[PDB]
């Protein structure tokens, strides 16, 4: 359509800047029914840790609101340190840093990993 490809074109500048800096990235995907979080290693290739609402401990019915995003954010922080990674860069993937995405980031900061 146009909604998705405008978002992908909106997210380009941040992603290329983080590859220029050669850092670890936290990428966020938001859908109307769920929300996703990944820790891509340094250059877009490998995934070190990930967490979402699709795992068989959060399929309870409300996975598309704020407090659902706060639970997964606390979860991805736990798996990140289990992989021995901190000092990451937050990638909003073209979404606005205002709502479910923003609440996701705060839980990660609270979870321990520092941007």
**What residues make contact with Mg ion under the rule CB under 5 A?**
9, 12
The nearer residue to RNA, 14 or 85, going by C-beta atoms, is: 14
Q: Which of 75, 76, 88, 101 binds RNA (CB under 7 A)?
A: 101
Under rule CB under 7 A, residue 64 binds RNA: yes
Residues contacting 65, CB < 8 A, separation 6+? 100
Read off the DSSP letter of residue 85.
-
Residues contacting 60, CB < 8 A, separation 6+? none
Min dist. Cβ of residue 55 to RNA (A) = 5
How would you classify the pairing of strands 24-30 and 88-91?
parallel
Interaction site with RNA (CB under 7 A): 1, 3-4, 6-17, 19-20, 27, 29-34, 36, 38, 40, 43-47, 50, 52, 54-56, 61-62, 64-67, 93-96, 98-101
């Amino acid at each position: 359509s146009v909604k998705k490809e405008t978002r992908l074109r909106r997210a380009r500048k941040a992603r290329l800047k983080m590859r220029e800096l050669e850092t670890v990235r936290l990428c966020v995907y938001r859908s109307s029914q769920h929300i996703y979080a990944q820790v891509i290693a340094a250059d877009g290739g490998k995934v070190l840790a990930s967490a979402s609402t699709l795992d068989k401990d959060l399929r309870e019915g409300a996975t598309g609101n704020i407090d659902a995003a706060k639970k997964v954010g606390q979860l991805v922080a736990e798996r990140a340190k289990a992989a021995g990674v901190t000092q990451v860069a937050f990638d909003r993937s073209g979404f606005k840093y205002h709502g479910r995405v923003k609440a996701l980031a705060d839980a990660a900061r609270e979870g321990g990993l520092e941007f």
